């Protein structure tokens, strides 16, 4: 009878809705986008053990089998080189974001309410929460979950004092299709599925890995053509890049990274030169301070809404999935008669803060290490 309203049909929100349905809980998702996107995401997601367990425990079996079918293994043995190809030091599931979303959306056609942009909520005096949308509509629910991403309006209303800070580190991310030709022109360590890190003398870094991703981002999702892409990530101090790097053309971003790699091994140049000019992304890294407890209520948050101020390279998808499994389990304990609602929400929030804080800390140190090189 408790009706859970979720803002956002992203990774976390869809996983959550599957989980709640499994436990017999009434659930609706309100999503700002239309059911058919115009552009596909150009990137891949690597699923770790937390993400994998969340998917297997929440998804209907037919969705889980589709996930197993679409994913591929991506490797361990991460290698470290200097910038002159000298080796310094030496199992996840890889899937495209577009496939993962199609799999997550399957079975939710009559759960997801499309074109519903959350604007605010109000507590109703009888208990319950009134949700207002940008088109002027409203709905009433018993529990509100903000799964609405890094700039979550739900979080901004519920926990207004949580503020992001600039890390002082920025990155430029590109992809290159592993075509027959490119495969011939790159050494095997670029294509074998083990990630590589290039550690130069300069205060910056180049990370190399692989994504499964669509060749053409301008087709319907069900028609996406999925291939292997090398992904590269150039990491440096924000102050070492142009003030307006985020407004640079793809061509200027490419030029800039090549300028930073003068003298580095030619294979690294070949990779960057052969990258896709429609999918090069500059990003300024932002983080948040340690999450302190807050008083629990029938409004809560999951995913990037509470974990990641930057939608970035990292483990955001996995953490969003982890949250969804956890919140499913806690809301199920209320449905099944074992715990009070707000107490169960509190338990979720306390556990989530513990791993959230740990992960944020790890991410921050990793970013700093790209510039300082204290780990060598």
* 12 is an annotated ligand-binding site residue: yes
DSSP 45: E
Could you say whether residue 147 binds ligand FAD (CB under 6 A)?
A: yes
Residues near 205 by beta carbon (within 8 Å), at least 6 away in sequence: 197, 198, 199, 234, 235, 236, 369, 370, 371, 373
Side-chain-side CA neighbours of residue 191 (13 Å): 17
215-220: which pairs have CB atoms within 8 A and are 24 or more residues apart?
215/177, 217/39, 217/40, 217/41, 217/42, 217/278, 217/279, 218/38, 218/39, 218/40, 219/40, 220/36
Residue 342 phi/psi, 5-degree rounding, is -60, -40
- The residue (of 232 and 264) whose beta carbon lies closer to ligand FAD is 232
Could you say whether residue 99 binds ligand FAD (CB under 6 A)?
A: no
Each residue 169-208 as x (binds ligand FAD by CB under 6 A) or -, in order, gives ----x-----------------------------------
> In terms of Cα–Cα distance, which of 26, 35, 83 is closest to 265?
83
Could you say whether residue 332 binds ligand FAD (CB under 6 A)?
A: no
- 């800390």: which residue's tokens? 361
> In terms of Cα–Cα distance, which of 250, 256, 255, 247 is closest to 276?
250
Could you say whether residue 12 binds ligand FAD (CB under 6 A)?
A: yes
Q: Which segment (2-10, 19-27, 186-194, 237-245) binds ligand FAD by CB under 6 A? A: 2-10
Could you say whether residue 318 binds ligand FAD (CB under 6 A)?
A: yes
Size of the site for ligand FAD (CB under 6 A): 35
* 118 is an annotated ligand-binding site residue: yes
Q: Which segment (53-61, 215-223, 249-257, 317-325) binds ligand FAD by CB under 6 A? A: 317-325
Contact 191, 199 (CB under 8 A): no
Q: Which segment (113-121, 161-169, 239-247, 268-276) binds ligand FAD by CB under 6 A? A: 113-121
- The residue (of 264 and 302) whose beta carbon lies closer to ligand FAD is 302
Could you say whether residue 52 binds ligand FAD (CB under 6 A)?
A: no
> In terms of Cα–Cα distance, which of 294, 308, 293, 301 is closest to 359?
308
Burial class (CB in 10 A: 0-12, 13-18, 19+), 183: middle
- The residue (of 226 and 372) whose beta carbon lies closer to ligand FAD is 226
* 134 is an annotated ligand-binding site residue: no
Q: Which segment (25-33, 106-114, 255-263, 332-340) binds ligand FAD by CB under 6 A? A: 25-33
Site of interaction with ligand FAD (CB under 6 A): 7-13, 30-33, 43, 45-46, 116-118, 147-149, 153, 173, 303-305, 308, 311-318, 320
Binding residues for FAD: 11-12, 31-32, 46, 97, 118, 304, 317-318
């Amino acid at each position: 009878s408790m009706h859970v309203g979720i803002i956002g049909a992203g990774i976390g929100g869809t996983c959550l809705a599957h989980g709640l349905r499994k436990h017999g809980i009434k659930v609706t998702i309100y999503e700002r986008n239309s059911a058919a996107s115009s552009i596909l995401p150009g990137y891949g997601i690597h699923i770790n053990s937390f993400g994998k367990q969340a998917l297997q425990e929440c998804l209907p079996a037919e969705n889980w089998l589709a996930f197993e079918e679409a994913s591929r293994y991506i490797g361990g043995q991460s290698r470290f080189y200097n910038e002159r190809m000298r080796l310094l030091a030496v199992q996840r599931l890889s899937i495209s974001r577009t496939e993962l979303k199609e799999i997550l959306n399957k079975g939710l056609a009559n759960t997801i309410q499309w074109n519903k942009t959350f604007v605010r909520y109000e507590h109703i005096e009888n208990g319950g929460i009134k949700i207002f949308f940008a088109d002027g509509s409203h709905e009433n629910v018993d529990v509100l979950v903000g799964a609405d991403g890094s700039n979550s309006k739900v979080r901004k209303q519920y926990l207004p004092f949580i503020e992001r800070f600039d890390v002082g580190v920025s990155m430029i991310i590109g992809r290159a299709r592993l075509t027959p030709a490119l495969t011939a022109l790159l050494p095997q360590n670029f294509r074998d599925g083990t990630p590589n890190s290039i550690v130069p003398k300069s205060p910056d870094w180049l990370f190399i890995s692989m994504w499964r991703a669509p060749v053409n981002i301008h087709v319907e999702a069900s028609l996406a053509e999925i291939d292997n892409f090398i992904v590269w990530v150039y990491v440096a101090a924000t102050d070492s890049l142009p003030d307006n790097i985020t407004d640079f053309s793809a061509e200027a971003l490419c030029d800039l990274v090549q300028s930073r790699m003068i003298s580095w091994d030619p294979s690294l140049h070949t990779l960057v030169q052969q990258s896709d000019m429609e999918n090069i992304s500059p990003l300024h890294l932002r983080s948040m301070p340690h999450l302190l407890p807050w008083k629990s209520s029938t409004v809560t948050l999951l995913g990037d809404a509470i974990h990641n101020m930057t939608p970035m390279t990292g483990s955001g998808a996995n953490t969003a999935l982890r949250d969804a499994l956890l919140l499913t389990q806690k809301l199920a304990s209320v449905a099944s008669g074992h715990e009070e609602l707000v107490k169960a929400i509190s338990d979720y929030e306390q556990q989530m803060r513990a791993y959230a804080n740990e992960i944020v800390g790890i991410s921050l140190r990793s970013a700093q290490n790209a510039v300082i090189h204290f780990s060598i």
